[PDB]
Write a protein that binds this ligand. Structure first.
Ligand SMILES: Cc1cc2nc3c(=O)[nH]c(=O)nc-3n(C[C@H](O)[C@H](O)[C@H](O)COP(=O)(O)OP(=O)(O)OC[C@H]3O[C@@H](n4cnc5c(N)ncnc54)[C@H](O)[C@@H]3O)c2cc1C
Ligand SMILES: CC1(C)c2[nH]c3ccccc3c2C[C@@]23CN4CCC[C@]4(C[C@@H]12)C(=O)N3
Ligand SMILES: CC1(C)c2[nH]c3ccccc3c2C[C@@]23CN4CCC[C@]4(C[C@@H]12)C(=O)N3
Ligand SMILES: [Cl-]
Ligand SMILES: [Zn+2]
Length: 664
């Protein structure tokens, strides 16, 4: 496919604003429709996931308009995604060769637990991702992911309007047929507001809860909450002076300690690029995905930037997520002039390993515009008590949220998004096919499981977060209890069986394993003990012993019960095939390698001989994954065979669950 510069030239020809060039790609037009089946408030990642899944699940059934107040896809924190997300992307027709042009490769998760009372001592827990011929995970710049999903939605009969705001004072939401009158303005100042007559409103306004806040007060969990402060830094080509052994930039890295933890996410940034040019680049990529262009014949990220007149750089996202019962000195003016900056630099110097780590990185000023060198957000976790009602439902952050740790926000939160997408077809048809009272009663009944799932989901995620935090207070509990149980309970068993039809059902059964009983039992034992030790104290060694022995005793039984075959000793660097801790074990599979030219992390797979980021050829060797323990030629062939194409929808297969097998 020859590249076209349609939007770049349209924008220039008409001096189009950012919002106007984007909205000109809508099937129905750049202006709003008079009516629609579904109106989605907010085009963050979840609003777009919802609209894409709803149209893909049953094409040509619902008219869907997404209203987004930003003039173009705006900055968002929340950059790390997991295999279920990539699988969703692949099921929507975008595989790894194309996604990697836009996003950074993610090969698993890694944890380093810093001893507070013995500065310099640390332990680690490291896992891998998957071979390049299996799947990938992604580190995504959210203005790019939300552009990608805007264009893809527009190419699948979904209208998305940037630069338009839902007016929640004049909007009417009712439960009788198409009782909704959604008021859409360009802002408070707008004299000319429009109304979209519609059947169903979806509140996807994230943490702002713009609609469902009118139905219930925000709810907070007992005990401490968290704050976060973060910034953006260079990404070093040479990672070898990072002060942690065997550190790899293509993991989502977690630096953990009693007060909380630090995330480290390497990802490419497109900031500085005109929006019309990016529309042309994304559109070209989708046409190449449509055509099935092989990876080596697809232009590299940097080449795309040259072709479409874009800006491209490598950056590292680095942030603290700490408890809000931490004591700070009254005067922090020595560490900067903004609170976010102050508390960031103050926390770094409290840990020599953090200061040594941070000394590998250079701060970027105002990557996302003025005022964005530093970010702070306080009191992270919350839940919406009411997430549906006559004429409306909520998805994503608007339902609740906990913490960045293990990235439940996108990857678990998309269970609500995709389930709501699937449910939307009968909800709209019910209202079109029955009188008002019975329709409303049948819709209420249909949504009871969605309400119950949401109700119980956030508290389970909150207990998961506290479980990990309290264990982060000791360099044995962190890797050997918290991380071990999260990975055993939450690994995505039978993900290769998921398809568009089963995705929502599978996703709502995952919950990162936080519903698994033996998980919750160990989590409660640890929280009940550690929460009684004041934060500024070290856990007594006897408490660690007792919790470690308890965790391992529950573990051996739960592991035996699991009927899922898994080369555990190849996935977790510190553990054997039965998930026993092994003090000196370092053997593990190797799926990735760093480009000698640009520093970007690459997947090893024989049909990708060039860097997908800069286009430089590696030697014809390499590119061979290292399986340790080894795999035969046949065993490796059978592995990639299962992950090629997703199974067609079989209405009689039962769904196999991601969680471990129950005991007899
Ligand atoms: C510090 C931190 C780190 C995190 N890290 C991760 C991570 O690594 N991985 C992960 O998966 N998750 C992470 N999360 C969670 C993640 O950021 C969110 O779960 C995710 O962005 C939710 O997206 P959303 O679509 O629900 O809402 P958002 O992305 O917030 O989008 C809401 C949209 O609604 C729009 N809007 C609001 N009001 C109106 C109106 N009246 N009319 C029209 N539009 C409107 C806004 O413009 C906005 O675009 C993190 C969160 C925090 C705080
Ligand atoms: C299930 C999977 C997505 C996964 N989910 C994790 C969660 C936490 C830590 C590690 C993982 C992994 C690594 C896995 C294990 N599977 C072996 C056969 C195919 C696959 C898929 C992949 C693989 O190649 N690597
Ligand atoms: C298990 C089931 C009750 C179920 N539980 C859900 C939870 C959330 C979202 C959807 C579902 C469904 C729909 C299912 C999926 N199963 C496929 C084989 C038989 C069955 C039973 C039924 C079916 O026909 N429809
Ligand atoms: Cl993660
Ligand atoms: Zn390169």
């Amino acid at each position: 496919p020859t590249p076209k510069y349609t939007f770049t030239e349209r924008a220039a020809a008409g001096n189009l604003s950012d919002a106007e060039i984007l909205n000109s790609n809508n099937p129905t037009g750049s202006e709003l429709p008079d009516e629609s089946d579904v109106v989605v408030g907010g085009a963050g990642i979840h609003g777009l996931i919802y609209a894409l899944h709803a149209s893909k699940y049953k094409p040509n059934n619902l008219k869907i308009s997404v209203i987004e107040k930003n003039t173009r896809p705006g900055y968002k924190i929340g950059e790390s995604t997991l295999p279920i997300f990539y699988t969703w992307c692949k099921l929507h027709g975008i595989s790894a060769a194309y996604l990697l042009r836009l996003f950074g490769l993610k090969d698993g998760l890694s944890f380093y637990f810093l001893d507070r009372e013995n500065q310099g001592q640390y332990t680690d827990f490291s896992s891998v991702g998957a071979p390049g011929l299996v799947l990938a995970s992604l580190q995504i710049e959210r203005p790019m992911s939300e552009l990608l999903f805007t264009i893809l939605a527009q190419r699948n009969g979904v209208n998305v309007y940037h630069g338009r705001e839902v007016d929640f004072k004049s909007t009417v939401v009712q439960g009788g047929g198409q009782g909704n009158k959604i008021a859409v303005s360009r802002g408070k100042y707008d004299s000319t507001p429009k109304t979209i007559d519609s059947a169903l409103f979806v509140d996807a306004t994230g943490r702002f809860r713009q609609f469902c806040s009118k139905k219930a007060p925000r709810h907070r969990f007992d005990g401490w909450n968290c704050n976060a402060f973060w910034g953006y830094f260079t990404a070093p080509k040479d990672e070898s002076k990072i002060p942690f052994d065997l550190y790899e930039g293509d993991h989502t890295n977690h630096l953990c300690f009693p007060e909380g933890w630090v995330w480290v996410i390497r990802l490419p940034s497109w900031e500085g690029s005109p929006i019309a040019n990016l529309m042309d680049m994304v559109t070209y990529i989708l046409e190449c995905a449509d055509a099935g262009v092989p990876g080596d014949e697809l232009p590299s990220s940097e080449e795309l930037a040259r072709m479409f007149g874009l800006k491209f750089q490598w950056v590292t996202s680095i942030g603290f997520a700490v408890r809000n019962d931490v004591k700070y000195p009254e005067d922090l003016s020595a560490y900067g002039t903004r609170e976010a900056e102050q508390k960031f630099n103050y926390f770094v110097q409290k840990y020599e390993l953090l200061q040594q780590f941070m000394s590998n990185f250079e701060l970027i000023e105002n990557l996302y515009g003025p005022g964005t060198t530093w970010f702070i957000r306080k009191t992270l976790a919350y839940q919406s008590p009411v997430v549906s009602g006559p004429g409306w439902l909520a998805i994503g952050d608007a339902c609740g949220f906990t913490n960045p740790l293990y990235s439940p926000g996108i990857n678990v939160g998309m269970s609500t998004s995709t389930w709501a997408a699937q449910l939307s077809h009968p909800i709209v048809e019910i209202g079109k096919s029955a009188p008002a009272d019975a329709a409303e009663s049948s819709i209420r009944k249909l949504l009871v499981p969605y309400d119950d799932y949401c109700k119980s989901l956030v508290p389970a995620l909150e207990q998961m977060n506290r479980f990990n935090y309290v264990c982060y207070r000791d360099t044995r509990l962190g890797p050997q209890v918290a991380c071990l149980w999260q990975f055993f309970a939450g690994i995505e068993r039978y993900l290769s069986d998921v398809n568009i039809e089963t995705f929502a059902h599978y996703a709502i059964k995952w919950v990162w394993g936080a519903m698994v009983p033996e998980y919750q039992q160990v989590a409660q034992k640890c929280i009940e003990h550690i929460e009684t030790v004041p934060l500024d104290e070290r856990l007594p060694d006897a408490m660690v012993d007792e919790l470690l022995a308890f965790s391992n005793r529950i573990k051996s039984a739960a592991v035996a019960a699991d009927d899922f075959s898994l080369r555990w000793d190849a996935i977790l660097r510190s553990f054997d095939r039965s998930l026993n801790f092994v003090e000196g074990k370092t053997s593990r599979d190797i799926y990735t390698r760093q480009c000698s030219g640009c520093g970007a992390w690459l997947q090893l797979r024989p049909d990708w001989k060039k860097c997908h980021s800069c286009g430089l050829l590696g030697t014809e060797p390499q590119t061979a994954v290292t399986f340790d323990p080894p795999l035969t030629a046949e065993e490796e062939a059978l592995l990639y065979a299962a992950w090629n194409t997703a199974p067609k929808y079989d209405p009689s297969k039962e769904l196999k669950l991601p969680t471990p097998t129950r005991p007899a």
